[model samples]
Target chain A: KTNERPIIGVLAQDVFDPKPDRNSYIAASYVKFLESAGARVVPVMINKSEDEYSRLFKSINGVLFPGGGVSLESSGYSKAAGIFYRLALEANSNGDYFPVWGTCLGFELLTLLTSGELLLSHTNTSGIALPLDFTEDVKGSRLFKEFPEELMKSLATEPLTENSHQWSITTENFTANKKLKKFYRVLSTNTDGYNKFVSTMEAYDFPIYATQWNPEKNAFEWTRPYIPHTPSAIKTTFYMANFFVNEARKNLHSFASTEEEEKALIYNYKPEYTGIQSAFEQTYFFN
Target chain B: KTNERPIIGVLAQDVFDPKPDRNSYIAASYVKFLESAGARVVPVMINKSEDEYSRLFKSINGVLFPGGGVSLESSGYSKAAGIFYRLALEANSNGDYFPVWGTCLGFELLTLLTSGELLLSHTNTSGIALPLDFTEDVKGSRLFKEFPEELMKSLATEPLTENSHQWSITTENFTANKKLKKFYRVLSTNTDGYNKFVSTMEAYDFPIYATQWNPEKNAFEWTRPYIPHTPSAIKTTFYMANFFVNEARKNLHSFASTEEEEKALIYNYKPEYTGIQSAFEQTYFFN
Candidate 1:
């Protein structure tokens, strides 16, 4: 990350062999969203080994675990995309000061790795287009602070989102997991009377966050690019993005402060959240 | 005309006033200069024919004349006191939809009009103040449209202000000569740019206006008790008082509709500026 321009590393979820680049293009929303907030957006295709990952870490401000369908099980590697994940893990171990944001499936993977577990398969999947009422926890959470009280009360008439998987996590599973409890805060919960949707989680006091809903996507007009039209919403997005960019720039600055190439040294910083979870939570949560 | 809350009539003059208050004060700025734009801030004095003038012109909004001395001879009166000058004219023409505005001197005499203009050679004088410039023309051409561009440009500055005589225009000098091309345009003027300084006039672009660099004396902020901060001087006095207030309340809906009013209106209307000097042009050039 040169001082001339802040370089952001957007992790591409998959290399889908399709027109219009379904994998990279969809995740490009994060780039667009971040760019509008004044951050330079760059997409990183996952195609390097652990050492390469470690080296590349020196050149970026943050990593995004963008959403896509990259099977957790492929060939001999159950962590088919474990290379990228391990890169992030390695970056953490090297004391690199980088902020990571994971969404949807990415969130589940983060949870699975941190709390060793597998997504629980349900007999019938929770279909798309359901209403969710904000819980008390959601009302007090800082992650979604920009939302109006009324709109936050209930998210109604969602898009015809496609869901190809049938898996979830349970509350009991999270409660019993020591690593999960220590690393992140349970920020939001969705309930359909008896069923609980593991809706959101965030690093207890850190900069990490994940959401079942595409906050950046539907935050404004449904499916019409994640642009906040209202003044307050616009200000809030700018504020958050500005903070992250400044932090990234600062960390990069520190790494480059001395003549020594400190990129390797910076990547060794460990993210506060780490551990393995039980099979029950993984199965119940990230099916 | 009493010091109490009451409406007053303002005969229009297009020139800027020198001596603003009849009691004691000074013209702030644009308020005195922009009467032609609308809304004069002259105070009404009771020394003039009391209920006779006010009752006749029920349409009188408020009377205000800024600081400036006019020759009673030019105004077609004898005495130096503007109080009699204000009353005699109104008494003569009992029932008329008239309003009065006196800034500094005019503002003071607005309260006093007990006798006729014959109350000769009263004690009063004028002071120094600059002229004004209308970057934009007053909407109603009947008053300000005829003013000399030199006076307008002079008033635009703050360093030089003229002060002259005591007794000033106390009669039909403004109204009677509206038919004449030379006198019709300028409601006020800083004529004695030499040792004496004082020029003030009136018009009907928006409403009425007045000044003496001391609009702080308005009933809203007048001090029976301690007076709050006053916005006087060339910039704050007339500009903020007369010009801005009229512009602000122009499209407040509940107000009456006049062709003049619509042009000044500001509901959901887009701001339109016509000339090379428009604000739009400035923004575009900078961008």
Candidate 2:
């Protein structure tokens, strides 16, 4: 069974300056990325009850944890993400095919979620674009199989993946951990001159995916100069988002009513333009 | 020269019950369509001075006339679009390499702009999806070249293209008019049981394209039942937008400064969620 009207959820992170309307935020690029691929988005606000998250999880086809600077262990982003993570695991185990995606901080959080450890190291990946070093397992990669052959070559040769995080789980550490190594397959890897880290990955048995690099930035973000906006780079963003949306299309989850669904959509909120000083061109701040 | 930071203009349409802040509006899908393909959008306002329109025409890479129920002869939508149409023709004539795109009503406007005649006929194409009857000339089509072979085949067989307009240029009328026949090369055509209309076309000598159907609706819209949200439908949207954005990329145009560009972006405004009652899920209303 497939849900053609797929509504995905995007987790909002805790904000530094807590105003009534600024307690949490979701970068608009993430919303645009998903919408570009034929899916409507619901913003999963921070500090919500586990039941609220459970209801949200059941209503949505899939969820995405966006890249942001926040407390991975103590912040509301982590807590809500943890709730959805467990819920998705339970649903998928019962034959309900729900997918999950993580970018940057979300990637690191997935590492902690799956392995039950804080195994992370600092890297020099902030503000740069790197060509993906595809692992041997990438030939049969579920996350990349739909990508055109020429696009795959360009992704391998050109600097297309936008990296903007300081922390990463090194491949050495990922390989040493039994849970991380067994649950996930490394599709691509990158280096910070000294540290080699997993750049792209997918769960072997679950509809879960992760990327330390930001695929949404190349097509939607303009604040950074290193963000590749080449024709192939744009194609990469579309292909990546397309795969995720299609993964979500396989899900059968939906809200009980159209009225309830309308109220929860990301369209209910307005994103503030924050490109002049902030890294994000627009951000949806929530209380 | 190529413009990595391509900024395209989307013309807003005049509304019926026009208030101060609701005189004109843009469907958010059009903005998302261009943004999804690595180009930023500027909302081209109505009732502005010719000089004001000229400045904006030069600042942006290309222009898109969106589909809406507006007077193609007297509305603000037509007035501003006419100004930009003239400027685009002038710029492209001088080898400045500007591009133009029109969807439905925008497609109608392009015909009037080029042919200086009203030759539209009523058709039963409202609220329906149809497969393209691709002409033999589509083999040499600049628009469909980048589309994957399987997608092209699907486009010809599946009812993936969304059509929501009542008026169209019948192929008979199009062929009869020297201005219409010579200026545009028909890539695809469709029938309304009795009337065969020009569904898709491109300029013979300029970087101009027109589609009597809505491509933006497939991936980004959900208020309608007939809108296709299949995987192939989503691919159709991305490919359509990618071709237009790439055409715009060939033109090197930019705002005078970052401050000016920021002020002109569609991000400067907020879109109101109008899905519960309107054809568009979200709309950007302007004063």
How many collisions per candidate?
Answer: 143, 0
Residue range A1-287, candidate 1, lDDT tens digits: 42323445556544335334232222323543454332344445444465655545665666566555565544112242355455555555666555666655666666776777764434233345334444566656656665444444434222222222255565666677788779877766554456576666777645566655443432112222222223223233333444445445434623344223222221111111111221010000000
Superposed by TM-score, candidate 1 places the C-alpha of residue B100 at a distance from the truth, in angstroms, of: 40
Residue A67 lDDT (model 1) = 54
TM-scores, one per candidate: 0.38, 0.99
Fraction of native contacts (fnat) of each candidate: 0.00, 0.95
Q: What tens digits encode model 2's per-residue C-alpha lDDT throughout A216-273? A: 9999989889899999999999999999999999999889898999889998999999
B-chain TM-score, candidate 1:
0.27
Using Cα atoms, each model's DockQ against the true complex is 0.01, 0.94
Clashing pairs in 2: none
Q: Which stretches of candidate 1 lie over 4 Å from their true place?
A: A1-6, A16-26, A75-96, A120-167, A192-194, A219-250, A253-287, B1-287
| Residue B82 lDDT, candidate 1, scale 0-100 | 49
